[PDB]
Amino acid sequence: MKLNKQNLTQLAPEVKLPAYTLADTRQGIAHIGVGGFHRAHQAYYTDALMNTGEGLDWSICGVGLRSEDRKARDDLAGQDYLFTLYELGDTDDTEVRVIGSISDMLLAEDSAQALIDKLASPEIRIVSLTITEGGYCIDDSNGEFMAHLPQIQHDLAHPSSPKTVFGFICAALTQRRAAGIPAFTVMSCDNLPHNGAVTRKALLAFAALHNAELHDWIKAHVSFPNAMVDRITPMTSTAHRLQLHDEHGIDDAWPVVCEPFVQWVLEDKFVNGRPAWEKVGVQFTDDVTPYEEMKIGLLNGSHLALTYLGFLKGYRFVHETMNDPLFVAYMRAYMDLDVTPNLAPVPGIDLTDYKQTLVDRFSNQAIADQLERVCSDGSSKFPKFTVPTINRLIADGRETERAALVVAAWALYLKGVDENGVSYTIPDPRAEFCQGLVSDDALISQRLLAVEEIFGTAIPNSPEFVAAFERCYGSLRDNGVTTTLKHLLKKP
Ligand SMILES: NC(=O)c1ccc[n+]([C@@H]2O[C@H](COP(=O)([O-])OP(=O)(O)OC[C@H]3O[C@@H](n4cnc5c(N)ncnc54)[C@H](O)[C@@H]3O)[C@@H](O)[C@H]2O)c1
Ligand SMILES: OC[C@@H](O)[C@@H](O)[C@H](O)[C@H](O)CO
């Protein structure tokens, strides 16, 4: 049965449906970057709220800034913007549900002015973001905005025909301001420590490139709440689409698969209101930092620790790494010895229990999360997920070898051949550049570790870290992943 408004009431009985009248909803959120995570997290909670009969004026208008986004728009439009959220997990606590909280989706390429007009509409009160970990154009080492990027210079030169996220937000804010319409909140839903502060730094820096007056008005009228967001969401696959049809009878052109667990912790800093998400499990706090350091350092950090070694070993799913005891032991040693000592207490959460739940969640066999997905964009992920932990170990004079192995694994992985002799390409926005850094084994540590916007300055200047990196890399190249882990694990 094709999913659409006509067949909504004709689906299998186990399929959960929106409880609200789809036609009564109105838009309040414009979301930039309509991918799997947005649909399985923000759209999911917004749909849940609407099912309680509240927040019907907070429907989401998706926004696609890239040509690849046309396919999402077409697929959703062909189903009256409905899509299936398909939970997969090793227990029965999984549900299949049709989500109705996204009511439209605009593509910048169809008309920049139509998109600016949507973003400047008074009913749109929050502009949310999933533009990836490296989408903010802020150098972690020195905190500066990359003003010299081509697309950034283009937007400064043609402010009414922007291409970038900051260009569209600025154009919309100036148009609202000219019409006497209040600003919206900009709500980052990407995985970065202090993601709201980063969003603010970037937008303000870009605004200052226009003038101080605009930079100052945005600083005083727009809020940028920080948040921790969590829900494992694999890439779309034909197998999952066929499984949804086989098991629940729905023909969905683009369902979103995700794990049952979901979490959202947010600072309540909204200038123009927000849905009452707290009624459906979203947690507001006065300080999200402990939550963000906990989740990014342990979950996202462990994902990088497993993914490159896993890919080299020939594994292709996260659960496969979890079926290898050496990988589980390595992950636990990384979490227990390297990350945990750096964490401040997190209200309402026991870290020992939490670490165990990460092992359980990564061990989900039914979800089939692709190592290609977790591996992707390491150039942007390392400074967010792993380097902060390494810097602390270096400053403390603590053992860096487990953390260095993650970087050594990435370096060998960049050569593009796994242990089964299979050649693969690198899904990274800076693939060519990174691959060139590892072309000469004799110069790898000197060249790879010297990229400041990825590794910072403590790493290349630490003889202890450099030594750990070099021996890990040599060991992986010569003895392979398994033996390297065996040796590392028999280490106090
Ligand atoms: N996938 C997960 O399990 C998960 C979990 C937590 C947080 N996230 C966060 O959300 C992001 C998206 O993951 P996903 O699963 O939706 O991925 P996806 O590949 O399904 O979609 C990524 C979306 O971001 C857009 N995008 C990419 N670069 C952009 C840029 N520079 N400017 C504007 N839009 C851009 C894409 O066009 C697309 O809309 C992550 O990068 C991360 O920060 C993902
Ligand atoms: O909530 C878990 C997500 O942050 C995680 O699946 C990331 O998308 C992953 O670590 C990216 O490599």
* C-beta separation of 341 from 402 below 8 A: no
Which residue, 418, 388, 404, is CA-closest to 473? 404
* C-beta separation of 86 from 118 below 8 A: no
**How many whole angstroms from 248 Cα to the centroid of ligand 1?**
27
Tell me whether domains 2-285 and 286-492 share a fold: no
How far is Cα 229 from Cα 404, in angstroms, rounded to an integer? 27
* Class of domain 2-285 as given by CATH: alpha beta
- 289 CB burial (10 A radius; 0-12, 13-18, 19+): middle
**How many whole angstroms from 133 Cα to the centroid of ligand 1?**
8
Which residue, 396, 208, 385, is CA-closest to 302? 385
- 337 CB burial (10 A radius; 0-12, 13-18, 19+): middle
Residue 91 identity? T
Q: Does residue 374's CB lie within 6 angstroms of at least one atom of ligand 2?
A: yes
> Ligand 1: which atom is nearest the Cα of residue 72?
39
Neighbours of 170 (CB within 10 A): 23
Ligand 2 pocket mutation, candidates 42, 45, 191, 372, criterion most atoms within 8 A of CB: 191
> Ligand 1: which atom is nearest the Cα of residue 69?
37
Using the CB atoms, write b or e for 40-71: b if 16+ within 10 Å.
Answer: bbbbbbbbbbbbeeebbebbbbbbbbeeebee
Using the CB atoms, write b or e for 357-389: b if 16+ within 10 Å.
Answer: ebeebbebeebbbbbebbbbbbbbbbbbbbbbb
Chain centre to alpha carbon of residue 212 = 32
Which residue, 150, 129, 268, is CA-closest to 200? 129
Angle, vertex CA 201, rays to CA 198 and CA 205, nearest 5: 145
**How many whole angstroms from 35 Cα to the centroid of ligand 1?**
6
Angle, vertex CA 239, rays to CA 236 and CA 241, nearest 5: 65
124 three-state secondary structure:
coil
Residue 384 identity? K
> Ligand 2: which atom is nearest the Cα of residue 303?
10
> Ligand 2: which atom is nearest the Cα of residue 263?
1
**Per-domain residue ranges of the chain:** 2-285, 286-492
Which stretches within 249-362 are classed as H helix? 289-294, 301-313, 318-322, 325-333, 351-362
- In angstroms, what CA-CA distances link 297 with 46, 312, 338, 382, 466? 27, 23, 10, 11, 21
Residue corresponding to tokens 């905190």: 143
How far is Cα 369 from Cα 310, in angstroms, rounded to an integer? 13
The approach used to solve this structure was: X-ray
**Closest-lying ligand to the alpha carbon of 299?**
2
Using the CB atoms, write b or e for 177-197: b if 16+ within 10 Å.
Answer: beeebebbbbbbbbbbbbbbe
Q: Which resolution in angstroms does this entry have?
A: 1.8
Question: Is 190 labelled as part of a ligand binding site?
Answer: yes
How far is Cα 284 from Cα 174, in angstroms, rounded to an integer? 30
How far is Cα 326 from Cα 377, in angstroms, rounded to an integer? 25
CATH 1.10.1040.10 fits 286-492, yes or no: yes
Q: Does residue 133's CB lie within 6 angstroms of at least one atom of ligand 1?
A: yes
Q: Does residue 303's CB lie within 6 angstroms of at least one atom of ligand 2?
A: yes
**How many whole angstroms from 308 Cα to the centroid of ligand 2?**
14
β-pairing verdict for 59-64 and 102-107: parallel
How far is Cα 233 from Cα 79, in angstroms, rounded to an integer? 21
Length of the chain: 492
How far is Cα 63 from Cα 65, in angstroms, rounded to an integer? 7
Question: Is 66 labelled as part of a ligand binding site?
Answer: yes
